[PDB]
Amino acid sequence: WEEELEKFIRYLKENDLPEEEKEKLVREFLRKAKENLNPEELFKVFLRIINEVPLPEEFKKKLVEEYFEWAKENLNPEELFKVFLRIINEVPLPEEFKKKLVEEYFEWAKKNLNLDELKKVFEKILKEVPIPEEFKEELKKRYEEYMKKRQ
Numbered sequence: 605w606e607e608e609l610e611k612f613i614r615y616l617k618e619n620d621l622p623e624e625e626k627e628k629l630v631r632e633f634l635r636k637a638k639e640n641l642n643p644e645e646l647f648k649v650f651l652r653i654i655n656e657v658p659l660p661e662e663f664k665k666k667l668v669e670e671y672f673e674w675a676k677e678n679l680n681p682e683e684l685f686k687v688f689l690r691i692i693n694e695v696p697l698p699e700e701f702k703k704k705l706v707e708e709y710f711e712w713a714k715k716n717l718n719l720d721e722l723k724k725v726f727e728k729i730l731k732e733v734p735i736p737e738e739f740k741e742e743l744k745k746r747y748e749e750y751m752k753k754r755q
Contacts, residue, residue: 605641609633609649613656627663634671643679647671647687654695665701672705676712684712685725692733703739710743719754 612633616626630653637646650671654664668691675687688709692702706729713722726747730740 605637605645605649609637609652613652616657623660623663626657626659630657630659630663630667631670634667638674643675643683643687647690651690651694661698664695665697668695668697668701668705672708676709681713681717681721681725684709685728689732699736703735706733706735706739706743710746714750 616629621629634646634650634653637649641649650667654667659667672688672691675684679687688705691697692705697705710726710729713725717725726743729735730743735743
């Protein structure tokens with residue numbers, strides 16, 4: 605549906621629309637593609653909207669939380685981790701909010717992965733997710749406290 609979104613991005617851009625009406629239309633499109641697209645195609649559209657459409661920054665944060673919430677509801681562990689990495693790397697987000705996504709996904713991994721999958725996923729986060737080393741130490745300590753509770 606790349607032609608459907610191309611006509612949609614041109615549709616919103618070609619009119620001086622108020623923020624609220626532009627927000628409901630971005631939501632309604634990301635929800636129509638949420639019910640019609642697979643998560644890979646849905647993310648390709650998701651990047652073009654945040655990038656191109658002039659939205660408030662807090663609304664960019666909101667779209668990331670809404671799409672990541674659905675991503676925690678209709679995605680297998682592998683494709684959710686791929687979507688999570690591309691949000692961190694390709695979506696322009698503040699660092700504190702990126703930390704919030706890492707902790708948000710870290711809680712999802714606790715609820716949906718065994719100890720080996722959580723172990724492999726955790727190592728890929730410390731190696732590929734751009735987070736401060738002080739935050740990496742805090743995550744490594746939270747991970748230790750969680751592993752001690754297993755025993």
